[model samples]
Target chain A: EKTVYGLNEYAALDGINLEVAAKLDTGAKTASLSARDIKRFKRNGESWVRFYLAIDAAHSHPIERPLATARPVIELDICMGSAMRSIEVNLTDRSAFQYPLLIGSEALKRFDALVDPSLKYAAGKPAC
Target chain B: EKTVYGLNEYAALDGINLEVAAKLDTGAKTASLSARDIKRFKRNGESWVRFYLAIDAAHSHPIERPLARVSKARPVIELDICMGSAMRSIEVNLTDRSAFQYPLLIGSEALKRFDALVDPSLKYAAGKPAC
Candidate 1:
């Protein structure tokens, strides 16, 4: 059975361990993460992206991050509800948005979950 | 039994009987349609909207509905839309969708009323509206 992940849930990025408040927005295609200093570079002929988490008050260590991938889009092992999967996510400026991380429908499909706006943090936290 | 609808389907606005290719967008909270020349006027102390269907533009359909509510300052209307076997009164937001592939977008709000789930791998999954 698919787990019930509510409208608002905490999602954790695997390697960085940066847990962000994500809005399970059923209105979008790809998952979006708030980032700054977004730049692309080549590593061994593979395209890679590097950025820092836009979370200012959450952590003090300056959540600088790196993503290794073949294409321009970055894939991350994002854990939410009871599942963790590497999904292609876009890094963009979402600082003005309420939720730094906006989980799209595609991401939810990979998590095999249902969105219940009536519930918040239904599955609690990322089980990863 | 829940009817299966693919990523794209034919949705009919019940009152207008205007059917258009629609994208079942799981990412949107509200369903939206293409419309042009929107004008608001008062009727019996209630607001109403009148516009032309921004479909082909070579002579499309005319639509008018009582204003439901406004978000982002776009005109919203409540109408029954038919998708496959699911028929529910849904909120349809009018906006410029000329650049989009489909003229209509059935967002999560309408899908919720339809009690449906989207299969991304498929299009026209339900064939056409049974309504």
Candidate 2:
């Protein structure tokens, strides 16, 4: 049971309310999201961070979420193809990369995503 | 139905009597073998090529095989590959891979046959296959 994914596809950051182009990179182990102006703060004795999802120069959505217990990454719901799951993502500056989101092996495995590098944008857009 | 392989593995180039380390690169469309001293000839009016598989600095195995067909680019030939009890015959292109870390690069075209799952964290997971 595997869902084939092209090199490029549309993905949605569910709770954060954002959709952007994503690259299915099997070479990476952990998923990553493009963020700008990241700042850590204390939220009711818990660790939290606030940042903006830098989808593009024109639209960057802001988000404030607590980090996963004992982990530096945060849990976020992502929708790609027909698969939807909460995946741990590290927010970092990815303005250098072409795609705004880089879907790694962790999310790929969880989403049953099999990469077909010969194709691109075959899934159309993320609906899940 | 699927075989997990590390980034590096010992693969047997059967009929050539060579065991060389190979890399499984999913990005490439076709498998490539490190070859040197490539020359083309004719056998009964059919196209053929003679080359040496370069395994290391000191070892190179000579081989002569008929070209599958005429290509706009280079000669394409089939070779038997043995890795961890899995033996498969696949088409390969002769190229200079000396600059690359691995002499052999098993590409997606060859990997699909083995249902290869690459684990980048591991190396030399499949030592060698008895051909």
Cα lDDT tens digits, model 1, B39-92, are: 888889999998876764654566778999887888899877888877889898
Which ten residues in a row are the worst by lDDT in model 2 chain B? B53-62
Docking class of 1: acceptable
lDDT of 2 by residue, A1-128 (tens): 56767667898889766788988665466778878777889999999998887754554567889987122588888898778888888888657867788877667777776666555787877787
Candidate 2 TM-score on chain B: 0.86
**Candidate 2: DockQ?**
0.12
- Of the candidates shown, which would achieve the greatest TM-score relative to the real structure? 1
Poorly placed runs, candidate 2 (over 4 Å): A56-60, A69-72, B1-131
For B1-131, candidate 2 gives per-residue lDDT tens digits of 66677656889877766777787665456777888777989999998888887754454566888888544576688887888878898788888656455678887777766666655445788776775
Every model's DockQ, to 2 decimals?
0.28, 0.12
List RMSD in Å for every model shown: 3.9, 6.7
Error of 2 at B35 (Å): 12
Q: Whose lDDT is greatest here?
A: 2
